[PDB]
């Protein structure tokens, strides 16, 4: 299964990071790519789309075999969020809070 069992546990820990006010998981917006219908410019603006569902699939199918690859995919995903969304918006804040959590997770697992 390669790194898939380790990544499944990381994603579960990420999903347990909830907003302090409305309890939404900070992973919510990152679970899948935006719809081209709703955001027609998203795939023009974002050169390397990434989402949690893609990360999980790539760990299952052998595209990502190392934690380094997962770390780069998460970094791109969060950078995409910070580039596309306004500072202080809920998506931007969730990206920053989750990225701080994943930075610590990678440190502890390296």
């Amino acid at each position: 299964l390669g790194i898939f069992p380790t990544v499944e546990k990381l994603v579960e820990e990420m999903r347990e990071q909830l907003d302090e006010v409305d309890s939404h998981p900070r992973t919510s917006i990152f679970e899948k790519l935006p719809s081209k219908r709703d955001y027609p410019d998203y795939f023009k603006v974002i050169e390397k789309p990434m989402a949690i569902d893609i990360i999980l699939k790539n760990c299952k199918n052998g595209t990502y075999k190392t934690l380094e690859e997962v770390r780069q995919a998460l970094q791109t995903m969060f950078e995409n969020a910070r580039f596309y969304n306004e500072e202080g918006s809920w998506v931007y804040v969730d990206a920053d809070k989750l990225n701080e959590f994943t930075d610590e997770w990678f440190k502890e697992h390296s």
């Binding site: 409305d22 955001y39 603006v45 202080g88 969730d94």
Partner: peptide
């Protein structure tokens, strides 16, 4: 920050010219 009521994103205005 509380999720936007629709669950929608917050695209930056400057991207309209990208």
């Amino acid at each position: 920050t509380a999720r936007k009521s629709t669950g929608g994103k917050a695209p930056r205005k400057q991207l309209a010219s990208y």
